[PDB]
Scaffold this motif. Structure first.
Motif, PDB file in Angstrom:
ATOM      1  N   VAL A 129       0.842  -1.165   0.000  1.00  0.00           N
ATOM      2  CA  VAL A 129       0.000   0.000   0.000  1.00  0.00           C
ATOM      3  C   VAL A 129       0.882   1.220   0.000  1.00  0.00           C
ATOM      4  O   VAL A 129       1.429   1.569   1.012  1.00  0.00           O
ATOM      5  CB  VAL A 129      -0.841   0.015   1.264  1.00  0.00           C
ATOM      6  CG1 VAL A 129      -1.605   1.300   1.393  1.00  0.00           C
ATOM      7  CG2 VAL A 129      -1.779  -1.153   1.260  1.00  0.00           C
ATOM      8  N   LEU A 130       0.996   1.882  -1.136  1.00  0.00           N
ATOM      9  CA  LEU A 130       1.968   2.962  -1.294  1.00  0.00           C
ATOM     10  C   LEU A 130       1.493   4.280  -0.709  1.00  0.00           C
ATOM     11  O   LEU A 130       0.467   4.810  -1.127  1.00  0.00           O
ATOM     12  CB  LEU A 130       2.328   3.139  -2.770  1.00  0.00           C
ATOM     13  CG  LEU A 130       3.023   1.903  -3.350  1.00  0.00           C
ATOM     14  CD1 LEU A 130       2.837   1.799  -4.854  1.00  0.00           C
ATOM     15  CD2 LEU A 130       4.494   1.921  -3.003  1.00  0.00           C
ATOM     16  N   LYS A 131       2.258   4.809   0.248  1.00  0.00           N
ATOM     17  CA  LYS A 131       1.968   6.110   0.860  1.00  0.00           C
ATOM     18  C   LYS A 131       3.176   7.038   0.938  1.00  0.00           C
ATOM     19  O   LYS A 131       4.317   6.594   0.921  1.00  0.00           O
ATOM     20  CB  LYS A 131       1.346   5.934   2.243  1.00  0.00           C
ATOM     21  CG  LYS A 131      -0.046   5.323   2.165  1.00  0.00           C
ATOM     22  CD  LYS A 131      -0.705   5.169   3.525  1.00  0.00           C
ATOM     23  CE  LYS A 131      -2.116   4.629   3.366  1.00  0.00           C
ATOM     24  NZ  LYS A 131      -2.792   4.477   4.677  1.00  0.00           N
ATOM     25  N   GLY A 132       2.911   8.338   1.015  1.00  0.00           N
ATOM     26  CA  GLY A 132       3.963   9.334   1.108  1.00  0.00           C
ATOM     27  C   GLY A 132       3.426  10.575   1.775  1.00  0.00           C
ATOM     28  O   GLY A 132       2.254  10.624   2.137  1.00  0.00           O
ATOM     29  N   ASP A 133       4.277  11.574   1.953  1.00  0.00           N
ATOM     30  CA  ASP A 133       3.816  12.862   2.447  1.00  0.00           C
ATOM     31  C   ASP A 133       2.855  13.466   1.437  1.00  0.00           C
ATOM     32  O   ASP A 133       1.740  13.859   1.777  1.00  0.00           O
ATOM     33  CB  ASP A 133       4.992  13.820   2.640  1.00  0.00           C
ATOM     34  CG  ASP A 133       5.945  13.365   3.722  1.00  0.00           C
ATOM     35  OD1 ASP A 133       5.473  13.023   4.827  1.00  0.00           O
ATOM     36  OD2 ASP A 133       7.166  13.349   3.467  1.00  0.00           O
ATOM     37  N   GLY A 134       3.292  13.511   0.184  1.00  0.00           N
ATOM     38  CA  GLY A 134       2.595  14.260  -0.841  1.00  0.00           C
ATOM     39  C   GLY A 134       1.328  13.598  -1.323  1.00  0.00           C
ATOM     40  O   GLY A 134       0.784  12.720  -0.653  1.00  0.00           O
ATOM     41  N   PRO A 135       0.845  14.020  -2.501  1.00  0.00           N
ATOM     42  CA  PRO A 135      -0.417  13.540  -3.072  1.00  0.00           C
ATOM     43  C   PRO A 135      -0.397  12.057  -3.505  1.00  0.00           C
ATOM     44  O   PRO A 135      -1.464  11.461  -3.669  1.00  0.00           O
ATOM     45  CB  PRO A 135      -0.600  14.449  -4.288  1.00  0.00           C
ATOM     46  CG  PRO A 135       0.778  14.774  -4.705  1.00  0.00           C
ATOM     47  CD  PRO A 135       1.560  14.908  -3.430  1.00  0.00           C
TER      48      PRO A 135
END
Length: 109
Positions: free
Chosen positions: A7-13
């Motif tokens: 499940v790919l997550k980051g700070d940005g959009p």
């Protein structure tokens, strides 16, 4: 079969889900899923430790990119299994090609 997902997550959009299916332990791995939040452009997926990109995707006017590929070099089992390593999506299409956008650990399902 084995099935796993990052499940790919980051700070940005940027967010995304990348699914991994393997029919037989000795067979290829289907890698498929999608990433939203992108700026239109070309991007790549990389497993930590990997040395190259798992594959490359291009993105929609809408910031969305779709992935379906076959990979017969990696596996969801054995001592080289990629279960537990980190999947990464990053700018600019290439192994070390660009900044990291989002990431997720590749979990078993």
């Amino acid at each position: 079969a084995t099935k796993a997902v990052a499940v790919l997550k980051g700070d940005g959009p940027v967010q995304g889900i990348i699914n991994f299916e393997q029919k037989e332990s000795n067979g290829p791995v289907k890698v498929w899923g999608s990433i939203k939040g992108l700026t239109e452009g070309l991007f790549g997926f990389h497993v930590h430790g990997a040395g190259g990109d798992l594959g490359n995707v291009t993105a929609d006017k809408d910031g969305v990119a779709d992935v379906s590929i076959e990979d017969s070099v990696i596996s969801l089992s054995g001592d080289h299994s990629i279960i537990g390593r980190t999947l990464v999506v990053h700018e600019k299409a290439g192994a070390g090609a660009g900044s990291r956008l989002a990431s997720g650990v590749i979990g078993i399902a």
